Design a binder for this molecule. Structure first.
Ligand SMILES: [Cl-]
Lengths: 216, 223
């Protein structure tokens, strides 16, 4: 009678909480254990049975795991209000506008992680940011930006964090995205997981995202 | 030069409030200076100050050590983070008292070594002979807030945490006058350098803009 759900910390700023809340309303008799962990930990947790569902942001594929893309979330650039890039907030900027800026990557957790994903997007277009500095967590990066130490690339849902003189600029490159996946065991056929799928679908319909006909 | 390098330690929770704009203004007013910033707990800041790893530390705990001195900057109010549908959310505009929270599922944080915010919050309850039963320890503030938003319970948070806004997360005023969390600036127990006095001056400026009530002696003594 216990569902165990793993999730990367960055998903706390997006739709995940309202998904869990709606899921809990339909399941008073179920025990919802929420675990914060990275995609690499979730994969091992799924096989072993430590979690039943995993929400992550990278696609490290595995025979025993069925991962489904929920959506591609936009990346944005966090800048100080006075930064030149903040003059291009309405229309947006491109990745190649960022290469001579002091870029704050995060987290400092084991790789692969969000900083590896960010650096991969740059390297996918032959872009080479020379002024790079890795810090521990998202709020540290935003704090440092607000204090005037650089810029940071962040998921759009990070706008949940509003700091004094911190502005978020849209990125125009189509592939300036960070995906969100739900991962379950390849064999999975539980009514709890399918109801979780249903809950996610229900909320994605409320927001009105573009989804295939066979999606979940 | 190393002489023109100032190293500042701070606890993570202070990034949601006034600290960043204080550092930005300090940097702006002293382009001569290299400012280095280190996130670390109040306990770590003590040894850092002693060995010269940092020159000033911003923290929320008074940990007495003869090698260190401090100044209280202000007492920040606490608030209760709740789900928008929670009964306590009816008091969002008026506020609630600590004894209203006793039978609630309270998410404490962080899960780092003690003493910390969880222990200080628990001390506030015990100071009034209140013993919350449903207590849960969680790693960090956004996990606590995310879980609150998921419907797991409530959490006591510094008021500047309101920088984080989540769907169906609401912040309720906590009315008890001692439901506060202090903010200190600690330095070596010696005469502050001119660079640290200049940091004091920046703090005074920002605090004047915010209208906080000090203390005639507060952060004074350049000469
Ligand atoms: Cl306050």
């Amino acid at each position: 009678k216990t569902i165990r759900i793993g999730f990367v910390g960055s998903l706390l700023f997006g739709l995940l909480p309202r998904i869990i809340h709606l899921y809990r309303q339909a399941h008073p008799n179920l025990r919802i254990e929420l675990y914060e962990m990275g995609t690499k930990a979730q994969t091992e947790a799924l096989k072993e049975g430590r979690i039943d569902a995993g929400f992550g942001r990278l696609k490290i594929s595995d025979p025993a795991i069925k991962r489904t893309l929920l959506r591609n979330e936009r990346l944005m650039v966090a800048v100080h209000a006075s930064h030149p890039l903040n003059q291009m907030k309405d229309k947006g900027v491109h990745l190649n506008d960022l290469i001579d800026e002091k870029i704050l990557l995060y987290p400092s957790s084991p790789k692969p992680n969000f900083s590896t994903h960010v650096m991969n997007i740059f390297s996918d277009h032959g872009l080479e940011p020379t002024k790079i500095n890795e810090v521990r967590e998202v709020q540290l990066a935003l704090g440092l930006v607000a204090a005037g130490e650089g810029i940071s690339l962040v998921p759009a849902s990070t706008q949940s964090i509003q700091l004094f003189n911190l502005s978020y600029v849209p990125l125009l490159d189509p592939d300036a995205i960070t995906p969100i996946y739900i991962a379950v065991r390849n064999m999975e056929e539980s009514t709890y997981i399918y109801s979780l799928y249903e809950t996610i679908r229900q909320i994605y319909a409320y927001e009105g995202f573009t989804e295939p006909p066979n999606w979940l």
